[PDB]
Amino acid sequence: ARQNLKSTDRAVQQMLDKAKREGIQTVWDRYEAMKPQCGFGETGLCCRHCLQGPCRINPFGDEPKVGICGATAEVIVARGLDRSIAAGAAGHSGHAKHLAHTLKKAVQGKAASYMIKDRTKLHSIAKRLGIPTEGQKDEDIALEVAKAALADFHEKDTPVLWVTTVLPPSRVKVLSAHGLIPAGIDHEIAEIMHRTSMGCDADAQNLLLGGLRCSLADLAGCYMGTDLADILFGTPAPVVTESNLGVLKADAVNVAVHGHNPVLSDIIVSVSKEMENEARAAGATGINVVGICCTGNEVLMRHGIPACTHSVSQEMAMITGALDAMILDYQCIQPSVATIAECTGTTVITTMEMSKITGATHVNFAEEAAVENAKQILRLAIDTFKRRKGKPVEIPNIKTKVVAGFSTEAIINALSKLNANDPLKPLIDNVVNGNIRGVCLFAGCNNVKVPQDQNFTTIARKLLKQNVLVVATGCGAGALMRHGFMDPANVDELCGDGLKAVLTAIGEANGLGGPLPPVLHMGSCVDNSRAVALVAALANRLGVDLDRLPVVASAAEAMHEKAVAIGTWAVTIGLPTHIGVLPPITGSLPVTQILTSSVKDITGGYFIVELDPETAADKLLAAINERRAGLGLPW
Amino acid sequence: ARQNLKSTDRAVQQMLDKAKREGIQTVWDRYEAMKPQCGFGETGLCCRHCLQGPCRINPFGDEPKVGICGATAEVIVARGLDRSIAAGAAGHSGHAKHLAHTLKKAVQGKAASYMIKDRTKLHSIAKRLGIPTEGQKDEDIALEVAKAALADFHEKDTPVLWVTTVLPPSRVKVLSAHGLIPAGIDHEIAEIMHRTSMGCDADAQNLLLGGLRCSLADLAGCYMGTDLADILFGTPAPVVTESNLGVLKADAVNVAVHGHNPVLSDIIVSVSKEMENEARAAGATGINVVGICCTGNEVLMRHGIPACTHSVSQEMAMITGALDAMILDYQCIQPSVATIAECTGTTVITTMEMSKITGATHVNFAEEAAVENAKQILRLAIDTFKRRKGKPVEIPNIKTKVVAGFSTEAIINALSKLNANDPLKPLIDNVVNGNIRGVCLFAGCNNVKVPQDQNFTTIARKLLKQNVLVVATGCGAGALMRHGFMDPANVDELCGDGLKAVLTAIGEANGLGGPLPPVLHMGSCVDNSRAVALVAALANRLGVDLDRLPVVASAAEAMHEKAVAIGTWAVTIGLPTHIGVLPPITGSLPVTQILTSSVKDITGGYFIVELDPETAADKLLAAINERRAGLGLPW
Ligand code: SF4
Ligand code: SF4
Ligand code: FES
Ligand code: FES
Ligand SMILES: [C-]#N
Ligand SMILES: [C-]#N
Ligand SMILES: [Fe+2]
Ligand SMILES: [Fe+2]
């Protein structure tokens, strides 16, 4: 087996060879077993929205040409996509909702493991929302912020504040004019499910305008999730750590935190440190907590917990034979982990009521009991460590250095060292003079269809050479960090001369004796919202709307419904947005034309669907340069 | 073409022959063009929940055996079903939400076309909810009831009151114990979408318990919708009208009201009466408003508007060439109507923002402007009538007499004529003595897979002969009414001797000089909730829970996601529930076993999946008789 065709990560390749020796089936094996995949589903031309179905439409040829109810290709494709957006919105905003409840519990005195850690963030959010702070206790301001967050999930006398208060007013006005401002987060999710059900909305434009609106409900959930997590757990600032499977340690209790919401795993980090002497008792050096996927990102950003792996290669951490526990919340967890555990010895633990996996051990996490849960979980891990006394392990000796923690506040602080009272100005100055060509946000998943990380690294390398300021989140940040893009030692090799000068100037002003890393890690997938905050602050400072800025986004290897939602609100807020896998839209040319062209006329943004990464990088550069030309700037 | 293989309705058959002459494609033609349908989708063994897909699992044989992420057949089947329930819940509860807003507008003075028509219903709902009425104005009690309705869509300090206040406390306690009581209607819809998204819930039992909970959010939306529609438009009482295509009149302006929410179509009924002289001016006799689907049911129940047709045969009304307008809200409208209109001359009009159809004319209905909208719409219809001056039409001369309007209040009133102060007792007495064997609720759609009405009539005929009290809603009521089951003249032919004696005793006590009809029409699909109210009142009166009563349900020809949701809450509240088409569950034996067997242990109810209607009738009789035996009654 040529393992480079599966993953470009060498640690992953090493574990693919071990899995193949050992007979352990992987995601890649399960993909091969699926080929050829259904061409109706690939093109979007399948509907199962009622029990007359399943319906399909031939992309070309003869009948069937139309759904049994009369639904055209246009309708079928748009309804499918809409439901994917709604599903993504449900995940991000479910995460946010859970943190809103957690904050309320904290400040009501019902969960003393949680607290207001970032009081400055709390007060700033309150002021953005219009919540009064003067003469109020912190707990009462917090209570009010949690109330406001929960209120945005339903209809009320205002629209969703975690949209209307986070974008420029001019953007809010353009979106309002088209009826795109969500009325309530769960309200919009529900309306999508209604309108896409049989015999309801059957006009592609109408359907896709609803999808745009629902993508803003997803944005709101993202931003809410970042705001509340920062209050509770601290706003990230720059941190130095490591990534890839080599961060596992044979002589330690290796515990992965995996999923998205870090509400327990932020506690598992703090508790694990207390339980060092109990680990040594069991003959370990200590507990080694490592991250997978976005819960990993969260604790990497705030605590510098090393990232073990991401997305499509998550099973490989188990294949080492050194992963004593994998502690799961929700989202992006291949349920194969529960069966692979039988072979590898790993204790897989679920913790959220609505996210269980057959064959995994469940712990009923509650905030009020967060410490005692953590200790129970870590004591299963220590027991699992002891069970592999005298078992050889194969941990690839492969890791990278990672500098991360670039929240928007952190980036503004860093810039402030160059201009204390106008911190955005040094960035704008260098956009204007061409040292920075523009900004690209890498976001989203890996996808088994694409050799792991190949699109992120191929595109990022072309953009960096062309002096684009590259920011990343989620498993796009994961890809980039595991390939060295977060190590400032690689700035000379990766970055154009203009970008290098800027990264160096900022880093030297921040006392580093060198540069910021090539790529700025802005956090988890909800922390795509931090990129919004940065770009909206730029917009405000420039007195223009986001669809005039030289800012693009790339979901270069997208997988999840969440990633579809994020791509869609990136287009809705005015960004040219690349997707590097085919969404199920090609079976309708009119819907494709809306999403890739005529939506420009509505929001200013638009999808760029391009599976060849070299070609995608050129198209993203063209988009950036078109924005530069619109502002009258050289390019 | 043998048209009896498509529909058992002779009017439909006549219009199928006309469509075939004229070259007009129908739903049946589009079905034939779809065959053979995809066997993955038929069995549920297809997933498109991420961009790694589409995934499928062979029902039998060799690979693929598992989804690319590891998702088993069990998981894939349960997630698909869950999303169908959520979609149904979104439709019913979207309808309810819209009526909650309408009521608020009414009583705030913002829409003087709407008002509190049923003050007794208002006050009773307020008292059920715990809303105080003593010394309060009607408008303020209404405002409070609308507030409460909207509050049930989100989390709060109570659970969904339109569940917990409408079921027996013992049923609420059984459901609470299993964690099945919804926390908020849109909250549950969103949580379903989250938990079924990639990498989240992956345990069939956990997934299906969430589905049960979400089906109760659907119940809540149903019940809310019936409550609010009764306040605004009046609670139904017995009414005499007609059904089938013969209710169209060549010399009149024929206007169909079609969809579900009647918020404008209740106004179109009242306004149409005012516009008689304007119709005569255009050379019509007057405006003839007729119903299709559940908006038709709503205005049949309250106003005795004749029902033209239902569900799968809706296009046939157009094929007559006499349907001048079809006025659409949302749900269950084959979008083919917009194209068939080009051929037939019919003006198809949409009226709801989130439900448009390419090629239809849109009118932006607003409550504040309800009368002026109605007149605009009716004036398009009159213009269309004039355009078919001297055009032969083919209206099959085929209609039935329909007695309907059996709300729960109406049924209780009717019974009260036999026992004024214990109105349920005469019904219970006749269950106990075997005159009434049990109760069956027919519900749900027609489905092109099943020759139209064949399952409803075949099953109903066997049950009626066995003295079952048969109640119906939606297009199950439609089926039954078009085949004569709502004409009391057919009681001798259709009903067993015990049922006939009861229907006759009630009818004679109500001054009729004969019987109630064979089948009691309890209204639209949301008015399945009325059957819940009746069965819960019986439960309360008997001091037992619903899963001990001899009450079953049959969705004999189900189609819509809404129908899946209704079937699922019928099982959740404790009913043996027949479905006469295959839901996409057969690809997982463990999920099938849960839904058809082990769910009994949780809720007392269970699905009966049976495509042969004779066999289904025997299984439904067996279920009824098993309940009789449990109560110690002969059978
Ligand atoms: S909604 Fe229409 S296209 Fe979809 S499965 Fe049902 S009949 Fe087919
Ligand atoms: S969620 Fe799993 S089974 Fe479904 S499409 Fe994605 S990889 Fe396939
Ligand atoms: S026909 Fe394959 S995705 Fe439905
Ligand atoms: S493979 Fe046909 S429904 Fe997906
Ligand atoms: C990722 N959300
Ligand atoms: C039907 N609902
Ligand atoms: Fe993520
Ligand atoms: Fe209906």
From Swiss-Prot, chains A, B:
Catalyzed chemical reaction(s): CO + 2 oxidized [2Fe-2S]-[ferredoxin] + H2O = 2 reduced [2Fe-2S]-[ferredoxin] + CO2 + 2 H(+)
Species the sequence originates in: Carboxydothermus hydrogenoformans (strain ATCC BAA-161 / DSM 6008 / Z-2901)
Bilayer topology: Peripheral membrane protein
Lineage: Bacteria, Bacillati, Bacillota, Clostridia, Thermoanaerobacterales
KW Membrane (keyword) present: yes
Major enzyme class: oxidoreductase
Protein name according to UniProt: Carbon monoxide dehydrogenase 2
Cofactor(s) annotated in UniProt: [4Fe-4S] cluster; [Ni-4Fe-5S] cluster
Superkingdom field: Bacteria
GO molecular function: 4 iron, 4 sulfur cluster binding; anaerobic carbon-monoxide dehydrogenase activity; hydroxylamine reductase activity; nickel cation binding; peroxidase activity
Subunit note: Homodimer.
Residues the entry annotates as binding [Ni-4Fe-5S] cluster: 260, 294, 332, 445, 475, 525
GO biological process: generation of precursor metabolites and energy; response to hydrogen peroxide
Pfam families reported for this sequence: Prismane
Broad class of the protein's primary localization: cytoplasm
Co-factor note (free text): Binds 3 [4Fe-4S] clusters per homodimer.
Localisation: Cytoplasm; Cell membrane
